[PDB]
Structure formats: structure tokens, C-alpha cells
Amino acid sequence: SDRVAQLTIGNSTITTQEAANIVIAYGEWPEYCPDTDATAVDKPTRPDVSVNRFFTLDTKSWAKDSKGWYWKFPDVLTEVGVFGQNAQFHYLYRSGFCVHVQCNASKFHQGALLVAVLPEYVLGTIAGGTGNENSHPPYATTQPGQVGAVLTHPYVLDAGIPLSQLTVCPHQWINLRTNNCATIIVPYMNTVPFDSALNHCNFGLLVIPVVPLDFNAGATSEIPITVTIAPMCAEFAGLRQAVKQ
Amino acid sequence: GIPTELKPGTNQFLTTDDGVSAPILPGFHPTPPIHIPGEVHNLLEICRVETILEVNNLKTNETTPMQRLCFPVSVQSKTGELCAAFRADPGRDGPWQSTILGQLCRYYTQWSGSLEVTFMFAGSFMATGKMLIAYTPPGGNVPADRITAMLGTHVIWDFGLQSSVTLVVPWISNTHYRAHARAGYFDYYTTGIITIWYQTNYVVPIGAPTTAYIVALAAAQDNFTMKLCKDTEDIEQTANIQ
Amino acid sequence: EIVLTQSPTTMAASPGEKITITCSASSSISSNYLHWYQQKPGFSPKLLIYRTSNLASGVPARFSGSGSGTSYSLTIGTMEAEDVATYYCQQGSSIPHTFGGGTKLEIK
Amino acid sequence: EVQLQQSGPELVKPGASVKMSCKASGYTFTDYYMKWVKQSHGKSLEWIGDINPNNGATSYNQKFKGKATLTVDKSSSTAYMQLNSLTSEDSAVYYCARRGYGLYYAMDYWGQGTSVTVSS
Amino acid sequence: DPIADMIDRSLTALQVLPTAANTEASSHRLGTGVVPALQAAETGASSNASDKNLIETRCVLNHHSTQETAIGNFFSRAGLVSIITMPNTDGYVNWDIDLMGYAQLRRKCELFTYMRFDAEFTFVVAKPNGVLVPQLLQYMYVPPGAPKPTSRDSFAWQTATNPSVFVKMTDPPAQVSVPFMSPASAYQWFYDGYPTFGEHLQANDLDYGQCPNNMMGTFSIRTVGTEKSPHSITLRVYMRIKHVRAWIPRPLRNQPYLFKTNPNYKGNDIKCTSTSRDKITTL
Amino acid sequence: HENSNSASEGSTINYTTINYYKDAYAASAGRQDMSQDPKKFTDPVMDVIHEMAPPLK
Ligand SMILES: CCCCCCCCCCCCC/C=C/[C@H](O)[C@H](N)CO
């Protein structure tokens, strides 16, 4: 009776039948900013029907020799929907999120994915290989859009920190014999109550295949992975003209 | 004025001293705090979360380091063979160096309390089997057969709907606290050896792959403590930064 | 890499006559990152034109330009010839930012 | 006023390292960037790379990577360019310039122009 | 009420635990339905199995304190943050404040994402061999935006509002106390994003990861005289951390550092976080 | 009294600090507090899982 679940927010609905529980990161639910912590003077806008709904990004393909992928938030939603238009016309935003990751396979496949949420995921470079370069990652890497980028050295997460203790972050697994969806609810985490939506990425989402995908020849070889996200308590403030990026 | 005396201990800078020092800004008031989620009040809260254990730390995995996080389970021809063995010392170098418990133990000297190890099976749904996971108190080497290794604390794990088991490593020691083990004289503080054996085979039908993998996680119990803070050798600064 | 073809190579005109210096870019680029520079002989270059229509302080307002897409032109049509120099159009929208071919003028 | 001051011309043999250093004053060194442009005879001016003086972040053109390295020191208000593996073809004039603020990323102040020549 | 639609939970509170948990006596248990050794790590929750649900235990009343692992005790230890040397040659230096040039204190502060504290600095000064001579010195803290000194005899050293400390070299080291002086509500060691606006090009790549809320200006020392002093100076700064709050722990870095401002690592020799052995069955 | 300006003022620690100046951030550290919340990192899960019952049934 605990394996099935249904999440409805906005005009969209996700149903699943092989689920684990729902993870609420740090035991905190997303909410609006109270008047004790607020600093801006003008009244914020709360659309809350057109922006608090499930958005579906593109689809990746899990090969037998995949490395991993990562997405940045709220970079993925700055070009889609009414969320993408409010973030271009306003100067400040504040929101929680809700990430849902689907990947299904048969009862004859095997594998394991680790889905984790790492706030302020700052990337790094290999310093030219030799270690004497003060290089910097390009703009297409630090902000990849709604497509997402792949990892080059997944053992250090391209940031010098090991994968073995990524599980200190709020995380779930996708073991292909038990469940096929993972779901984490993230509140707003920052040192400031509002922030710009075009200059700053709050957290990052990493999906890394720990145990590699295996099957026999003759089974289905196209195993796709899909990410679905939804803002929770989005507010905007500081109206302005449209700034594209 | 008031007659006074100066004792030994004057004009010394002890770095661990806690005292009052003169402020540089009168009337200053800091920025008010807001509610940020996820506050840490004690380092013992981070030591209870489970992190991956690198049991497969061979000398051939050093070029493709993603293979170290999983160790294989396959279909055997003999009975009662062993799959892996590793020491249970979190302070010694080895598989425990990859955890947040083994990296925060390097900052202290003595530790106490019991640990816990969790295994997670990453095979297919159609595969079954049983394993034997045994913890042996100090005194011997690695046991030679399964009939000797089972005389200690053990658990028998059946692969099924619940894909995880937990073996608790209970606190069995002569002393109250236990410093870090090492070669030489400090292996008086060893805590034993964790092995894993095949109870029955790894049975699989036609059409499903014949090799699975197991991920091993490790944490701490609620009676775990640490004391006598020091520094770690897990970082070295041979050259100047930048 | 992105190539700039600055045409023509030589020029000789009278005072008061129009001087048209054309740059042709292989890709349609953003017009606001294009710039123009002026090099006195034996001296360092100097910025003339930013934003393809606007001038820095110390420059007379006779210099102007209008271009979009592939072709890009700058026009001076005045009398004085105390400034004889080589001219370079420098695009900066795509990386690396590259200069033009080069145009120098001569007077009568 | 703000002016860029460079170093004098230096003569070395092919196969040795040489240093060129330009120093600026009259403005805060940390707020603005610094670019390096190479002008060869018969060719146009070529962009080597730009550098942030605040953190020592660097950038290089892909034809010049390995040819020359950029670095900076914050206190003495100096930014110098090291030249390794010189050939005869590197004999050109090198300019250091700074990026503009109100301009749409334009070099507005340039140096005196240092010169290198390479012969045995 | 003309519109019925416009009129229209914490998980766990914290508690005081001075000592570690006790152990209660247990006996054998044979039954069906109840099973505490089988868990599910796929839910992202750690296991809740204790000692008594697995083995048979005795009663243990342990009085092991948990004071040592509080974050106030983990950080209240002075560590080296800078070494400043006056061989530079004109009797004064300017050192822009960046306290992450030494790897020992950097690995401790980078365990958390956000931190908010009070500091306490100590200035140890000697010649480059340790020998002390009588010589008068002046340290000045320059907040961001103030004019920084350009010479030994500049007007900036008049210190009408900038805090300054005068000391001679044969004293005990000087100690001051600094408040929390950020515009934000905490310091952050990791900033994902660009501080400025505009279209990002190659020239904008040099700005990534720079938070302006952590720049605290420069720190200037000099010899108080107006002519050339015949001595060399070497200054060391140590910093304690008091009144600490910290949020959102992170993984600890396992690769050696290269620069002061970014997590770049040397990509050729990726160090494995564990020491390797020969075979998996024989330790 | 004194002007209250410390980095730990909303949620403060034990009451044993010593101070001789007027500014409260100059005080000593004092003995730290014993409070902790181990549940919000090890069980950040909506539906409550007990110890006896199987978790995925
Ligand atoms: C005469 C008193 C001089 C001492 C003044 C020192 C005040 C500065 C204390 C700042 C405390 C740390 C703030 C930021 C630390 C790092 O430098 C930045 N995060 C760099 O990333």
C-alpha cells in the first residue's frame, strides 16, 4: 500500500506504482518568506497556479558505459512556461522545488542510479592536465540549460570531492529491481531571502550510475532517463523590462 | 596601586586559550539572521549518515576508479567460498577512508561505541541467493573456511523484496576508548575482521546476467563518541597555493 | 576561426569627399560588439567607434557607421586630413575576438 | 589621467625565455581587466589573451597556448607576460591594453608598445 | 464571501543530550512478521537498527560526554592564515584579505556551505630567522572602498577613522576581535554564479565563483619611521573562530589544492581516496 | 548593561561567557551546548518508518 503514490500540484499529476517514500530535504517544507526575514519593500507577486506545476525536461539515454549527468537550478526553467517569463521581467525570485526522476526497465535488467541534490555545486577544471593553468570552465558548462551536461571525471564529480560521501546530501537511489522513481522536495536555501534568477544557481542535481547497466543480448537496449520538476512556493519581486540573460 | 604578582605563564601565546580580547569597532551591530534550513549543532549528527565503503580497493582499479565502489557476486562451482574481507578499524587506512565517518575520525584520537554496516544488492529481480556476513573479534587472522568464521557474530541475508541488510559491529573492547590502530605496537587497538561468505549459490535463470554487484555502506550507532582533537594527514601542502 | 575581410586595401580621395571602408564577416554577428580603431604611424592604436554608431571623448563627430549582418561600413566625408592612419574593424561577439584586414588611406 | 607604461625592447636568441612587463597607475588596478595584443608585420593585430588581476584567472588564444603565459601580482600593480620557446617568427610588437567599463567591452587605453626581435 | 477560493509542518525538534545513549538488556526472539535487520537503503534514510534488535545485550550505563564534538570546540583553535614578508622593498606592504591560502584551516571551513562567526586575530612578528630587535610597527585595516596607502609617508596613515594598532617587536603579540561584518546573513565559501550582469563571453569567464559579500578590503603594515629601516620583517597571522553557526554540510576534499579562489585540481594524477591492496580476500 | 551584538544572538549558547568591554562580540567562548537533532539528516522522509515493521510493504 506504500508502493503507490500520486503527486498533484497545479494542473498536472504524476502517478507511480513502484516507488520508495518521498524525501523532504532537512525536514523543512517550502513556504513563503515571512515579514520578519523580508527586507525588500515592494509587494511580491505570487502567480501560484501558472508557475507551480510539473515541468518535464529532455530525455537522456543510459548506455552501458555512461558517466553521469548534472542539471542546475533554476537554470533549467528560465526559458520555458510562465516561470521563464516572470524570471526575465523580475529582478528577485524565491522558490522551493520538487524533483522527480523516472527510469524504468524490465525484470531482467540490472543497475543502480544515485540521485542526489548538492547546493552550491561549483564546478572545476583539470588545470590543463599538468596543474599549472588557472583555467576556468566555459559558459556552456556552468550553465548548460534544460539539456544538461555530462561528467568527465565522475569519481571526483568534476569538483575535487569524492563520490563515496555524496550521500551526506539529500538523496535517493534507483535500484532497478525494487523501484523506478526517485523524488526529493527541496526548500529555499540561501543566505539571503531573495536572489536574482539569472546570475545565481541555488543547487545542482546529479544522476550518476554507480552500478553499471547490464542485460543480455536480445533485450531492449534503449533505457531512457527522464527528469520532471515543479516549483513550489515561487514569488517574484522587482519588476523591470525583459533581460534575456 | 593594588599590589600584584606575575607567575610563570606570562606573555605566552597558547593557541587553544579562550579569553577576552579588545574590540576594534564600537557600536557595531551585525546583520540580522534569517532562517536557513539545515543547521548543524554537533559533529555527531553527520557521523550517523551512511556513506559508501570502498571494499574493492585493488591495485588495478587505480586508473578506472569508479570500479572501487562495488564488488562482484557470481555463480560458483564450489561451496562455501568467500567473497571479500576487510578490517573493521575506521581509523586505519583502507576501505573506511572513503566514508564521512572515517574522515571525521582522523581529526580525533580516541573513539568509542558501536558501528553499523549496510549492504545493498544491485542484481536483477529474478536472481536469488544467500550470504553469510560475519564479524570476528581480535585474536586471529582471516579464517580459513566457513566453519571457523561463523563462530563469531554473524547474520544470514536472503535476497528478496527488501534489498538491504544491516550487520551491527558491537562494542567489544577491554578499554573504554580505543585509539587508532596501526602496525607495530598500536595494533593492540584492533577491532577485528569482517568477512562475507557464500551460504548458498547465486542462482539465476536463462536470460538474466550471471554477475551482480553489492554496495556497502557504513555509519555509526547512537552511542558513538570521540575525543582528543588533533589534525589529519589526509591533506598535505607541499607547494604554496597559487 | 571567424574571418574578417576588410575591403578595399588602398584609398586616395580629395577633401570633402566620402570615404567608405567596408568589412565583410562570414557569419551574421551581433552589431553592438563591433568596434573601430585608429593607429597613428609609430604610435599606439586608439578607439574611434563603439556600438557601430557612437564615439569616445576627444573625437570629432564626423565619424559614423551603419552595418548589419555580413557587410559593415564606416563613413567619413569631411575636409580635414590631419589624421592619416590605418583603420581596423574588430569584432568581439564570438571567441576569439579578431581584428580586420586593415585599411590605410592617402591624401592629395 | 591614466596612462599605460611598458618596458623597453629586449633582444634574445632563439630558444631562450624573455620577460616583458607593463605597469599601470592612476586608477585602481583591481577593477579593470588587461588584454595583450600582438601586431606582426604583414598581418593584422592578434589577440594573445586577457587576465583578471584580482584572482589571477587567465585565458589564452588557441594558437598561442604553450607559447606564452600570463600572470599578475596585486600589490605592485604590475602585469607581466612570460615568453617561452621563441622562434624568429615571434619578432613583432606587443601591446598591453585594458578593457573599458561603459564601453561594450572595448580597449580604450594602450601601452607604449614593446618590441621583441629574434636572431642569433 | 463572494469568492470561496481566496479565503482558503516541522518534522522533528531538537533536544538536549549531554551523554551518549544507554544500552538496555535483551533476550532471544523467535517470531514472524517483525524483522528489524532487513532495511531499504533506496528510501534515502539511514538504518534504525540498534544493538538489541540484532544481538543479546547487557545493561550498560555509559557517561561518555558529547561536548568535544560540538562545533564550538571543533573551531576554537588558532590556525595560520598568512605569512607576510617585508624584504615590498619600500617599507610597506598591502595584503588583500583572503584567508584561504593554507590548506589546513581551509579543509575545516569547507566542511560547511554557510558559516557565521566572530574572529580573533593574533600577529606574530620577527625577523626571518626569529631574532627580535626593537622596532616600531603599525598595522592598519582598510575597509573596502577606502583609499589604500601608496607610500611609507602617505596621507592614508593618519588613521582618523580606520582602526590601527601600534606595537613594537619586543612585545607579546597583538590580539584584536572582529565582528561578523558581511552584508548577507552568513559567509559562503562556495558561490555558484557570476556576480555581474550582461552577456557572458570569454572575458566574463574570469569572474565565475567570486562572491562580493566575502571581500573585506586590504590590510596594510609599515615601519612608522620616515626613512629606510635596516631590518627585515616577517609577519604571521593566526585566527580563532568564536560564536559559530554552520549550515548544510558538504563532502570533504580529497585532492590537493592549487589556487586560492577556485576548486581546480590537477587532472593528471587523480589521487584515489583509499590506499590500495593486492587481493580482495587477503587483507 | 551592554549593546547586544554577537553572531549568536537568536539561537544562543550557554550562559557562561566573560566580558570586560561594552561590545558583546569581544566575549569569551564559554562552554558549548549539548543540543542536537540527529533525525533531520538520518530520517528526512515523509511517511514514518518504524523499526519492527518492514519498510517497503
Ligand atoms: C587591525 C585589524 C585587522 C584585521 C581585520 C580582519 C577582518 C576580516 C575578517 C574576515 C573574516 C572572514 C571573511 C571572509 C574570508 C575569506 O577571505 C573569503 N571568503 C575569501 O573567500
- The reply to whether E47 touches chain A by the CB within 8 Å rule is no
CA atoms within 13 A on the CB side of E279: 4
Distance CA B182, CA B200 (A): 36
Grid cell for residue E127: 625577523
The CATH number of the domain holding residue B47 is: 2.60.120.20
Distance CA E249, CA E246 (A): 8
Please enumerate residues of F whose Cβ is less than 8 A from a Cβ of B. 3, 5-7, 9-10, 18-23, 25-30, 33, 35-38, 40-42, 54-57
Grid cell for residue E146: 577606502
Going by alpha carbons, the residue nearest to atom 2 of ligand 1 is E141
Residue F56: list chain B partners with CB under 8 A: 161-162
Burial B227-241 (b: 16+ CB within 10 A, else e): beeeebebbeeeeee
CA-derived radius of gyration, chain C: 13
| Domain parsing of chain C, residue ranges | 1-108
Domains held by chain B: number: 1
E123 Cβ contact partners less than 8 Å away, ≥ 6 residues apart: E139, E165, E167, E173, E174, E235, E236, E237
Distance CA D18, CA A63 (A): 51
The residue among B183, E259, F43 whose CA lies nearest residue A27 is F43
D103 Cβ contact partners less than 8 Å away, ≥ 6 residues apart: C47, C50, C56
- The reply to whether A176 touches chain B by the CB within 8 Å rule is yes
Distance CA A185, CA A197 (A): 19
F43 Cβ contact partners less than 8 Å away, ≥ 6 residues apart: E12, E45, E46, E48, F49
E162 Cβ contact partners less than 8 Å away, ≥ 6 residues apart: E140, E141, E142, E143, E146, E156
Q: What region does A120 belong to: left with phi over 0, alpha with psi -120 to 50, or beta?
A: left
What residues pair up with B36 in beta bridges, in sequence order? none
Q: Are residues F19 and B18, on separate chains, in Cβ contact within 8 Å? A: no
Q: Is E215 in the pocket of ligand 1 (CB under 6 A)?
A: no
φ/ψ of A86, rounded to 5, equals -70, -35
Indicate the DSSP class of residue E98.
-
Q: Is E111 in the pocket of ligand 1 (CB under 6 A)?
A: no
The residue among C38, C91, C54, E202 whose CA lies nearest residue C100 is C91
Are E264 and A127 a contacting pair, CB within 8 Å? yes
Distance CA B223, CA E61 (A): 11
Q: What is the DSSP string of B199-241?
A: EEEEE--TTS-SEEEEEEEEEE-TT-EEES----SS----S--
φ/ψ of D24, rounded to 5, equals -125, 155
Span between the terminal Cα atoms of chain F, in Å: 60
Q: Look up the domain containing F3 and give its range.
A: 1-57
CA dihedral in degrees (B24, B26, B27, B30; nearest 10)?
Answer: 0
Mutation site for E-interface testing, chosen from A31, A49, A161 by largest number of E Cβ within 10 Å: A161
Q: Which atom of ligand 1 is nearest to the CA of E98?
A: 17
The residue among A60, A186, A172, A73 whose CA lies nearest residue A121 is A73
CA angle, E214 as apex, F20 and D105 as ends, to 5°? 150
Q: Which atom of ligand 1 is nearest to the CA of E181?
A: 10
What residues pair up with D23 in beta bridges, in sequence order? D5, D78
Instruction: Kindly report the nearest CA distance between residue A165 and chain E, in angstroms.
Output: 6
Instruction: Kindly report the nearest CA distance between residue F27 and chain B, in angstroms.
Output: 5
Q: Which residue segments constitute the domains of chain E, with CATH numbers given? A: 1-283 (2.60.120.20)
Distance CA C45, CA D95 (A): 9
Grid cell for residue E251: 563532502
The residue among B182, B179, B114, B186 whose CA lies nearest residue B153 is B114
φ/ψ of B27, rounded to 5, equals 70, 10
C100 Cβ contact partners less than 8 Å away, ≥ 6 residues apart: C4, C6, C23, C88, C89, C90, D44
Amino acid at E167: V
Helix/strand/coil percent split, chain E, to 5? 10, 30, 60
Grid cell for residue A45: 507577486
Q: What region does E193 belong to: left with phi over 0, alpha with psi -120 to 50, or beta?
A: left
A181-186 vs A23-24, strand pairing mode: parallel
Q: How many other C-beta atoms lie within 10 A of the C-beta of residue A67? A: 14
**Residue of chain E whose Cα is closest to the Cα of D60:** E202
A85 Cβ contact partners less than 8 Å away, ≥ 6 residues apart: none
- For E43, the closest of F23, F28, F55 (CB atoms) is F55
Distance CA E190, CA A120 (A): 6
Domains held by chain F: number: 1
Q: Is E93 helix (H, G, I), strand (E, B) or coil?
A: strand
Instruction: Kindly report the nearest CA distance between residue E256 and chain A, in angstroms.
Output: 9
Count, residues in chain A: 245
Distance CA C71, CA C77 (A): 20
D68-73 vs A12-16, strand pairing mode: unpaired
The residue among A128, A19, A17, B186 whose CA lies nearest residue E43 is A19
Distance CA E19, CA B227 (A): 13
- For C44, the closest of D46, D62, D111 (CB atoms) is D111
CA angle, A138 as apex, A132 and A144 as ends, to 5°? 140
Q: Are residues E40 and F26, on separate chains, in Cβ contact within 8 Å? A: no
φ/ψ of F40, rounded to 5, equals -85, 0
Distance CA B101, CA B169 (A): 14
The residue among E278, E283, E281, E258 whose CA lies nearest residue E268 is E258
Mutation site for E-interface testing, chosen from F8, F40, F52 by largest number of E Cβ within 10 Å: F8
Grid cell for residue E57: 545485550
Q: What region does A128 belong to: left with phi over 0, alpha with psi -120 to 50, or beta?
A: left
Chains F and C touch (3+ CB pairs under 8 A): no
CA distances from A169 to A45, B43, B46, B53, B70 (A): 31, 15, 10, 16, 20
Mutation site for F-interface testing, chosen from A2, A98, A173, A179 by largest number of F Cβ within 10 Å: A2
Q: Which of E139, E214, E257, E259 to mutate to test the pocket of ligand 1 (most atoms within 8 A of CB)?
A: E214
CA angle, F10 as apex, F7 and F12 as ends, to 5°? 70
E248 Cβ contact partners less than 8 Å away, ≥ 6 residues apart: A26, A119, A189, B36, B37, B38, E112, E113, E114
E-assigned strands of chain B?
Answer: 51-52, 71-74, 82-87, 110-112, 115-121, 128-136, 153-158, 164-169, 178-179, 193-203, 211-220, 225-227
Breaks (C-N over 2.5 A) in chain A follow: none
**E35-38 — which CB contacts under 8 Å span 24+ positions?**
E35/F52, E35/F54, E36/F51, E36/F52, E37/B155, E37/B165, E37/B166, E38/B162, E38/B164, E38/B165, E38/F54
CA angle, B123 as apex, B119 and B125 as ends, to 5°? 115
Are B114 and B169 a contacting pair, CB within 8 Å? yes
Are E224 and E152 a contacting pair, CB within 8 Å? no
Chains D and F touch (3+ CB pairs under 8 A): no
Q: Which of E117, E166, E187 to mutate to test the pocket of ligand 1 (most atoms within 8 A of CB)?
A: E187
A224 Cβ contact partners less than 8 Å away, ≥ 6 residues apart: A59, A60, A61, A62, A103
Are A159 and A121 a contacting pair, CB within 8 Å? yes
Distance CA A72, CA A141 (A): 10
Q: Are residues A135 and D56, on separate chains, in Cβ contact within 8 Å? A: no
Distance CA A208, CA A159 (A): 14
Q: Which of E142, E216, E237, E241 to mutate to test the pocket of ligand 1 (most atoms within 8 A of CB)?
A: E216
Edge-to-edge strands, sheet with A223-229 = A23-24, A181-186, A97-102, A223-229, A55-62
Indicate the DSSP class of residue E107.
H
CA angle, B197 as apex, B193 and B198 as ends, to 5°? 175
Instruction: Kindly report the nearest CA distance between residue B73 and chain E, in angstroms.
Output: 13
Residue A193: list chain B partners with CB under 8 A: 34
Are A170 and A184 a contacting pair, CB within 8 Å? yes
Amino acid at A5: A
- HEC secondary structure over chain A: CCCCEEEEECCEEEEECCECCCEEHHHCCCCCCCCCCCCCCCCCECCCCCCCCCEEEEEEEECCCCCCEEEEECHHHCCCCCHHHHHHHEEEEECCEEEEEECCCCCCCEEEEEEEEEECCCCCCCCCCCCCCCCCCCHHHHCCCCCCEECCCCCCCCCCCCHHHHHHCCEEEEECCCCCEEEEEECCCCCCCCECCCCECCEEEEEEEEEEEECCECECCCEEEEEEECCCCCEEEEECCCCCC
- For F47, the closest of A21, A26, A178 (CB atoms) is A21
Are B110 and B181 a contacting pair, CB within 8 Å? no
CA distances from A38 to A43, A192, B46, F6 (A): 11, 9, 31, 21
- For A189, the closest of B38, B98, B215 (CB atoms) is B38
CA atoms within 13 A on the CB side of A153: 23
Helix (H) or strand (E) holding E222: strand E218-223
The residue among A177, A131, B145 whose CA lies nearest residue E264 is A131
Instruction: Kindly report the nearest CA distance between residue A15 and chain F, in angstroms.
Output: 17
Grid cell for residue B184: 607495530
Q: Which atom of ligand 1 is nearest to the CA of E121?
A: 4
Q: Is D80 helix (H, G, I), strand (E, B) or coil?
A: strand
Alpha helices in chain B (DSSP H): 100-104, 146-149
Q: Which residue segments constitute the domains of chain A, with CATH numbers given? A: 1-245 (2.60.120.20)
CA distances from E263 to A54, A113, B241 (A): 34, 26, 12
Grid cell for residue A8: 498533484
Amino acid at E89: T
Q: How many other C-beta atoms lie within 10 A of the C-beta of residue B145? A: 11
B76 Cβ contact partners less than 8 Å away, ≥ 6 residues apart: B198, B201, B202
Q: Are residues F7 and E73, on separate chains, in Cβ contact within 8 Å? A: no
Q: Is E138 in the pocket of ligand 1 (CB under 6 A)?
A: no
Q: What region does D42 belong to: left with phi over 0, alpha with psi -120 to 50, or beta?
A: left
CA distances from A201 to D64, E111, E208, E210 (A): 33, 20, 12, 13
Distance CA C18, CA C14 (A): 9
